[PDB]
Amino acid sequence: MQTIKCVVVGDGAVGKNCLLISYTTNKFPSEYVPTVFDNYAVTVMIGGEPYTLGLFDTAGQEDYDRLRPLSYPQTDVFLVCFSVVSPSSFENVKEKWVPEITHHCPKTPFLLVGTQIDLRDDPSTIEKLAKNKQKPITPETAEKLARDLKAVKYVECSALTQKGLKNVFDEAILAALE
Amino acid sequence: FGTYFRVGFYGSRFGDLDEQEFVYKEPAITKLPEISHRLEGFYGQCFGAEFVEVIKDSTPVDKTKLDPNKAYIQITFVEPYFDEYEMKFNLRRFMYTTPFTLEGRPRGELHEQHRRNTVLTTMHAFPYIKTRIRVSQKEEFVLTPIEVAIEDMKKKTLQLAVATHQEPPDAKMLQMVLQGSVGATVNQGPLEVAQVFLAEIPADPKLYRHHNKLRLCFKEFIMRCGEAVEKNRRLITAEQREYQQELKKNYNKLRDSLRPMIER
């Protein structure tokens, strides 16, 4: 078939762009070639079948609240992203992102995507959050949230370590095919 | 076909392989995370995981910055390499690029941004009896900031042109390239490129060639945007009317802004 349209949303500064550009270019974060252009196409094989993903990168800021949904029609799957070391970004999944995409596309599948998981188990990061009266988001709570908000599932990845990165896009395709 | 990767090993734990580099041929479409997990996992089984690290960058390795006790693997996507003149089976040469600035960081402002093209020559040619081949030579070439911008433009222009004129039509792919071309909301958009590189007509004649080349890439680029816009008008759903209006508005504004710069 044709391009699978995957719209990627979530708070600014959760690493959305970094993971899209890294995966689609086969580059680690420090080596990706910068571009003045938006979004990303990638062809991926699953079970010996090629599939093409159009990845629509979006601006999470309120300035784009009116413009952003203009991209929503015909979306095949959404990625709703938060950083596992940013409780605010996680809370915004609940109060902003899920309501927004489900208001526009009530029947369209979406995944919850946790990012920056490489920082989650770092003791110094945990401790820095602890001093700020925060804790990181565990897979258990995000999985529970995914089930509670009726996401197709929860996936997580590190743009840096590459851990779970292939899997995020595979599950996006699998969610779009049904 | 296959997907190629530069692979190099660092630390005395690797014995004979220490400091050796290869080009690996992976099947079909293999992505960085997959070969990376394979290699890190394999060496984790040999050495124990605590001793194994993947180098997360393509820059030449400085052993003094490494924990001597560990086994480091540098893994870099490469494509089969042809000199520009060649551009217009047997593969001995492969290239990876890495962004850098003269101020010592990988990424910077448009006017700072260089790119290094590292060209690897293998000891033998693919196709080959084994699945990886030793690297026998490494050369480095550099693109200056305007040259980096020229490539960014040409490559986007081609992507957009294909998205626009492919049959059968794929409206999703067209909209994705096009919105990202005239409608960028995350990255800064191509206007900035023209303002930086084309706004002043350089005194230096060597620089005039690149200036003129970039100017011509902008002609081609904005032309293909217009074709993209008119084409999409025909592909959209009624729901997407306001979406299209915006894309058209974005195109017009960019077109009018570039105009003075494309004539010069």
Pair of tokens at residue B60: 């030449």
Q: Are A160 and A28 in contact (CB under 8 A)?
A: yes
The C-alpha atoms of residue A81 and residue A156 are separated, in whole angstroms, by 9
Method: X-ray
DSSP string, B42-85: HHHHHH-GGGEEEE-S-SPP-GGGS-TTSEEEEEEEEEE---HH
CATH 1.20.58.740 spans which residues of chain B? 145-264
At the top level of CATH, which class does the domain A1-178 belong to?
Answer: alpha beta
- Note the residue count of chain B: 264
A contacts of B113 (beta carbons < 8 Å): 34
**How are strands ordered across the β-sheet holding A153-156?**
A40-46, A49-57, A4-10, A77-83, A110-115, A153-156
- Contacts of residue A131, Cβ cutoff 8 Å, sequence gap at least 6: none
Tokens of B170: 């794929």
> Phi and psi dihedrals of B140, rounded to 5?
-125, 135
Q: Which of A62, A101, A63, A66 is nearest to A81 (CA)?
A: A101
The residue with tokens 């014995």 is B15
Dihedral over Cα of B91, B97, B102, B103: its sign: negative
- Check if the beta carbon of residue A156 is closer than 8 Å to that of residue A142: yes
Q: What is the Cα–Cα distance from A66 to B256, expressed in whole angstroms?
A: 25
* Residues in a beta bridge with B3: B26
Contact status, residue B14 vs residue B41, Cβ threshold 8 Å: no
CA distance A84 to A75: 25
Tell if the CB–CB gap between A37 and B36 is shorter than 8 Å: no
Output the DSSP codes for B112-167.
G-EEEEEEEEEEEEES-SSSEEEEEEEEEEEE-HHHHHHHHHHHHHHHHHHHHH-S
CB contact under 8 A, B242 and A52: no
Distance CA B28, CA A42 (A): 14
Closest CA to A51 of A163, A177, A178, A155: A177
Domain boundaries, chain A: 1-178
What is the three-class DSSP state of B41?
helix
- For residue B145, whether the previous peptide bond is cis, meaning omega lies within 30 degrees of 0, is no
CA dihedral B166, B172, B173, B177 (to 10 degrees): 120
Work out the burial of residue B66: count CB atoms within 10 Å of its CB; fewer than 13 is exposed, 13-18 middle, 19 or more buried.
middle
Angle between the N-to-C axes of helices B205-235 and B241-262, in degrees from 0 to 180, rounded to the nearest 10: 160
Q: Which residue has the tokens 């090629």?
A: A50
Q: Say which residues have a Cβ less than 8 Å from residue B168's Cβ, sequence separation at least 6.
A: none
Count of Cβ atoms closer than 10 Å to residue B49 Cβ: 11
CA pair distance A170, A178, nearest whole angstrom: 13
A121 neighbors A29 (Cβ within 8 angstroms): no
Tell me how far apart the alpha carbons of residues A78 and B174 are, in angstroms, rounded to a whole number.
19
For B145-264, CATH number?
Answer: 1.20.58.740
The chain A residue lying nearest B109, using CA atoms, is A34
| CA B2 distance to own-chain centroid | 18
Q: Which residues contact B57 (CB under 8 A, 6 or more apart)?
A: A28, A30, A31, B74, B98, B106
Which of A29, A38, A45 is facing B184, going by the closest CB pair? A38
Cα(A20)–Cα(A115) distance, integer angstroms: 12
Resolution (angstroms) equals 2.1
Q: Answer whether A38 sits within 8 Å of B180, measured CB to CB.
A: yes
Residues paired with residue B156 on neighbouring β-strands, in sequence order: none
Distance CA B228, CA B162 (A): 10
**What residues 69-98 of chain B have any CB closer than 8 A to a CB of chain A?**
76-77, 97-98
Q: Which residue has the tokens 């770092």?
A: A122
A155 CA to chain B: closest CA distance, Å? Answer: 15
As a whole number of Å, the CA-based R_g of chain B is 22
Q: For residue B55, give both structure tokens.
A: 């180098």
Terminal-to-terminal C-alpha distance of chain A: 13
